[PDB]
Amino acid sequence: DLADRFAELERRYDARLGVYVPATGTTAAIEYRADERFAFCSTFKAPLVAAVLHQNPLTHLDKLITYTSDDIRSISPVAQQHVQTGMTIGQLCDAAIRYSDGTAANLLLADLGGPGGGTAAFTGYLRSLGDTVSRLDAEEPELNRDPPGDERDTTTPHAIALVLQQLVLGNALPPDKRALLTDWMARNTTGAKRIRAGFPADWKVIDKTGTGDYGRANDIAVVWSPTGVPYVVAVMSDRAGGGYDAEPREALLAEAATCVAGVLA
Amino acid sequence: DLADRFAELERRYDARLGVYVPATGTTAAIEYRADERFAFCSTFKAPLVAAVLHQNPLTHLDKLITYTSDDIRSISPVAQQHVQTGMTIGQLCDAAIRYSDGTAANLLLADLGGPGGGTAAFTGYLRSLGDTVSRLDAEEPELNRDPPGDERDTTTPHAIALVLQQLVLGNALPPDKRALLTDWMARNTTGAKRIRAGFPADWKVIDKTGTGDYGRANDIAVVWSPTGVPYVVAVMSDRAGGGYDAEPREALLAEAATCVAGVLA
Amino acid sequence: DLADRFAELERRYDARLGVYVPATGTTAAIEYRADERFAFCSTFKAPLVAAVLHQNPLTHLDKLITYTSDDIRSISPVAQQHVQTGMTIGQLCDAAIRYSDGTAANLLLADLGGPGGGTAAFTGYLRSLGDTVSRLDAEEPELNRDPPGDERDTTTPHAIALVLQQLVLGNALPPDKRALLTDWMARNTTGAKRIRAGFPADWKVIDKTGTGDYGRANDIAVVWSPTGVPYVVAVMSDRAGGGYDAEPREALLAEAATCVAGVLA
Amino acid sequence: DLADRFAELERRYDARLGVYVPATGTTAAIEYRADERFAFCSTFKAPLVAAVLHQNPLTHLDKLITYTSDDIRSISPVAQQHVQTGMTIGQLCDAAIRYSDGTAANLLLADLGGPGGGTAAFTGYLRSLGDTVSRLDAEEPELNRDPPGDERDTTTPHAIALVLQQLVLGNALPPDKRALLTDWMARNTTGAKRIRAGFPADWKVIDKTGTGDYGRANDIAVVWSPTGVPYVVAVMSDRAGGGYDAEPREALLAEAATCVAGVLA
Numbered sequence A, B, C, D: 001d002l003a004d005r006f007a008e009l010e011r012r013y014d015a016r017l018g019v020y021v022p023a024t025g026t027t028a029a030i031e032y033r034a035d036e037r038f039a040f041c042s043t044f045k046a047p048l049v050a051a052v053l054h055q056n057p058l059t060h061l062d063k064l065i066t067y068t069s070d071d072i073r074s075i076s077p078v079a080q081q082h083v084q085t086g087m088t089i090g091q092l093c094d095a096a097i098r099y100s101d102g103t104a105a106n107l108l109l110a111d112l113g114g115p116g117g118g119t120a121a122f123t124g125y126l127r128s129l130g131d132t133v134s135r136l137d138a139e140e141p142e143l144n145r146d147p148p149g150d151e152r153d154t155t156t157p158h159a160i161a162l163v164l165q166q167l168v169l170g171n172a173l174p175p176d177k178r179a180l181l182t183d184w185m186a187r188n189t190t191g192a193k194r195i196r197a198g199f200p201a202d203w204k205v206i207d208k209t210g211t212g213d214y215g216r217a218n219d220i221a222v223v224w225s226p227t228g229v230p231y232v233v234a235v236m237s238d239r240a241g242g243g244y245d246a247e248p249r250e251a252l253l254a255e256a257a258t259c260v261a262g263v264l265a
Helices: A003-013 A041-055 A058-062 A089-098 A102-112 A115-127 A157-168 A175-186 A250-264 B002-013 B041-055 B058-062 B089-098 B102-112 B115-128 B157-168 B175-186 B250-264 C002-013 C041-055 C058-062 C089-098 C102-112 C115-127 C157-168 C175-186 C250-264 D002-013 D041-055 D058-062 D089-098 D102-112 D115-128 D157-169 D175-186 D250-264
Strands: A016-021 A030-032 A204-212 A216-224 A230-238 B016-021 B030-032 B204-212 B216-224 B230-238 C016-021 C030-032 C204-212 C216-224 C230-238 D016-021 D030-032 D204-212 D216-224 D230-238
Touching: A003 A016, A003 A030, A003 A250, A016 A157, A016 A250, A041 A089, A041 A102, A041 A115, A041 A157, A041 A175, A041 A204, A041 A216, A058 A089, A089 A102, A089 A175, A102 A115, A157 A175, A157 A216, A157 A230, A175 A204, A216 A250, A230 A250, A250 B250, B002 B016, B002 B030, B002 B250, B016 B157, B016 B250, B041 B089, B041 B102, B041 B115, B041 B157, B041 B175, B041 B204, B041 B216, B058 B089, B089 B102, B089 B175, B102 B115, B157 B175, B157 B216, B157 B230, B175 B204, B216 B250, B230 B250, C002 C016, C002 C030, C002 C250, C016 C157, C016 C250, C041 C089, C041 C102, C041 C115, C041 C157, C041 C175, C041 C204, C041 C216, C058 C089, C089 C102, C089 C175, C102 C115, C157 C175, C157 C216, C157 C230, C175 C204, C216 C250, C230 C250, C250 D250, D002 D016, D002 D030, D002 D250, D016 D157, D016 D250, D030 D157, D041 D089, D041 D102, D041 D115, D041 D157, D041 D175, D041 D204, D041 D216, D058 D089, D089 D102, D089 D175, D102 D115, D157 D175, D157 D216, D157 D230, D175 D204, D216 D250, D230 D250
Parallel strands: none
Antiparallel strands: A016 A030, A016 A230, A204 A216, A216 A230, B016 B030, B016 B230, B204 B216, B216 B230, C016 C030, C016 C230, C204 C216, C216 C230, D016 D030, D016 D230, D204 D216, D216 D230
16 A cells, blocks of 8 residues: 555665654554664654753753863764853754754753763653653764664654654643744754655644664654644664665655655645 | 545545546556546646647747737736737747736637637647547637536546647657747746645646636646656546536645655655 | 936836825835826726725625626726626626726726716715825726826826825725725736836735826835835836837836835835 | 945944945946955855866866765754765855855865865965955854954955956856856855845846854845846945844845845846
């Protein structure tokens, strides 16, 4: 049916594809490799910001954080410019969502505290939303390069989608903090050629991307139909076997997102 | 199986929907009420320009055509402003396609000459392209308001798609004239809410719309995937049971375009 | 000096130019040939609708009017399509504003009643707004063809701008009927190459055009700056030297509007 | 007299405005703070692409360039997505112009080679085009945040306009390379709210923006009137007194551009 096409896309792009769209009152749940583990990559930065939002008051966003050149370890377009100034938690939230800033992610993890620099605290926060599957075990950038089959730093489309649904559409955050998360995801700058490129333009798309080694490309998104009905779309992919250096295939995520749009129309 | 969703859309918009997409080297043809007659409405203006282009050398586009206020019998956004100046044949071609100018269509028909002010010449031109089904019997605006069931001024999605395929993708025109038709269709200003609105923005869409009474709304198009594969999409609809005054539902054609887009991806 | 450029534009297009923009709380009044008479042409159809609106309850808009083929005298893109069914007064209002339908204008004049088919009733209505200068003496299409120098069927930019100002921005109509006037002008289809083409796209433009012999091209408009400040812009022009058959020059009005936009910015 | 409005805009936006429009055969040169220094910001990325095109044959564009995560030290919407793949010289030129990619600019500077990572080679190239004032001293992102008064990384409206005039309209590049620069600037995606917003839509606008700290917002452009005459428009601004964190005001540049268009009309 529809699962036969995702296979075609798996063959045509030489990737393992995972897609999950939660069921609504009007549509059935789309599942393809939904409960298989894919690496989080940078998509955890969306549940990372809401966690800082969850246990901290709004004033905590004005707290300034100072850091050194040694702390810059992953792709960090914003953090590199403020080593002299330092950045506040709210600025780190912006940078981690809207630019996938690796260093802001590592700093926000440290703000959650705990063992492993915040990995235990973050995974613990996922648990509070019913997610018993995903886990975060490393920081940036090691969390992008775990070998295929390794369960560390992984989620599944099924799990990441239900988490994202409670954060954007559900009640996991009060509306005060919820509009900050959504607005950062809405003005994302890293995801133009993924889920957003597969949906018609009169559909509104907020997303958080993830990219890593072994051809890992992810995109988690909330979409709104032109009449205003919201859907959650989890799209993950890798190309293990093509090797650690496999090039990620963004076109696969865009093609699969047009596939989803055909079902929801 | 795509027919299950189209019929659901017929029920939701209170309309009869017709869709045909020709088969390509790799994908099968999409059909839904493909061989049922729908009223041409303004979609005939696309093969009409091709007919004028076919019968005349390119310098014929400079011939100046004058008309009077009595010639303005229908919505004519460009022809209404040049009654003192007149318009050249190429200017009538521009207006008949990019603004669906009614008077420009009537003049171009008269340029084909023959019985019925050019309707016979235009219908014959369809015959020369293998179209054994379509027929144009009146001019603007009478062709938009034939009662439901009347075969006059009707085509079928199957027939209009094959005609459009030879004009844009085939060789029914030489390359110089073919690029003129394509560019006029590419810069159409009337189809933003139909097939163009159902396809992702990285798909190129050239189209010609048609609208008339009894809630008649059509859109014929050639689309190009982001990888450059061309497909022809003929979408037609009326709501004849709703009466002469029934409103066309443009969103029906955009949604049908999104269902088709999911299959072609 | 803005008066030097208008004179420049006069030589470059071989035309007489008239511009009036009422003074606001923040800007000075723009004047160029403001108190010289130009032919109404179709610009009277905007205050004509307000006259029908003023004397009649909203239910008067539902009155059906029947007419014959002898009643169609001028460019009438809409009236030609409803000779069998007829059009309601409200449809004649829509048709007169958005398509400059000459025949609908003649019927709306007859709706105002009085001697000369409503011309006496119509100028009388202008007088009720302080306009002691303008006058309408004929119906369509003769009102377009008066010799240069004749005072019949003439207004001035100063007079038509202040009238239009009371109708769109002032209190000449109650808000309910006033929103009907403003909406019809806002979706006008005949003015894309006049004032609308000379203002940036983030400026909102509602207008009513006029065209006639002796190269007569007009546009009266209300514009809104990107911050929401409204201005009234009256632009009229003819080329009485080029003769009766002189071609109207729309680019002159578009260029003249860019000079105005430069001063209001 | 155009200097009075430019003044009122400086006061209205708490900003210093710089405007230069080179003189053509019929119109005089518009100057406002024409010879004062404003920070380049990203506007130098347009002559930088022209420098790379000038010193290399067209095949040099296919050379693949690799970079590390440590090379991303500024907003790089395209370079961030190809750290594993690498990018060709032509892809960096595309990214440096159409998305203002900071990393693509730094690599393109490195392609120019020489002392200072190419900054001295870039300044030397401007010198060869007659530019006696401009200077580029740092790369991204330090060049955006020089303190007010520091002459480093500055040009002038007068100087940047004449450089741009030679690159697009003059003969500094052969037609094959010149059409490459022109097409990149024509499809820029960062300048919709600056010079492009102040000009009517029937004016063709190609531009390259620049933004930085101290409220620095620039836009350099070539515009084409509807009849096809080209003008070069240099608009630069900062708000240095408001501090390092001062917000740039894009509307100042659109408003200044509408004043310029009123004069060029």
